[PDB]
Amino acid sequence: APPPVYDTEGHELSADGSYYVLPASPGHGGGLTMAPRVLPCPLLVAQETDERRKGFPVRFTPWGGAAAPEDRTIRVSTDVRIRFNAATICVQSTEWHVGRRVVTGPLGRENAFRVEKYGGGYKLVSCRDSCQDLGVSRDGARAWLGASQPPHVVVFKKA
């Protein structure tokens, strides 16, 4: 199998754990959060502009869910679903999907992502059809995660 994804303490990522998604280096902003874009729902995936803010941790789920193989180690280059492990003001799914921007809430493969080793950490990729790197775009007061260059390089700090 492809290698496991590792957290900032060097342990393999697990489908059981929750992980803050932080930049791999200082001076690149804070962690990922969910925030409304003009409408209060659905929430979209934003990056905190403030470096001190870790945002909300995420949970990874191997593609297939309960029907995926029993080895639920999270690995690179492998379809996974991603959600925020957090209560939401929208009473909707916190699972990520792409239709540009990464959105949560109700909707093939719109919710398929992968993690790839990249630079000093990992990049996240949307793989609805072909794999597209996810990057951050400042948009007024907010910075949004979407399909864009350059990729946003991240590490996973276990909560």
UniProtKB/Swiss-Prot annotation:
Domain of life: Eukaryota
Annotated PROSITE patterns: SOYBEAN_KUNITZ
One GO MF term: serine-type endopeptidase inhibitor activity
Disulfide bonds: 41-90, 127-131
Site (Reactive bond): 66-67
Keyword entries, A-Z: Alpha-amylase inhibitor, Disulfide bond, Protease inhibitor, Serine protease inhibitor, Signal
Gene3D superfamilies named among the record's database cross-references: 2.80.10.50
Biological role: This protein inhibits independently subtilisin and T.castaneum alpha-amylase but not barley alpha-amylase.
Family: Belongs to the protease inhibitor I3 (leguminous Kunitz-type inhibitor) family.
Protein name: Alpha-amylase/subtilisin inhibitor
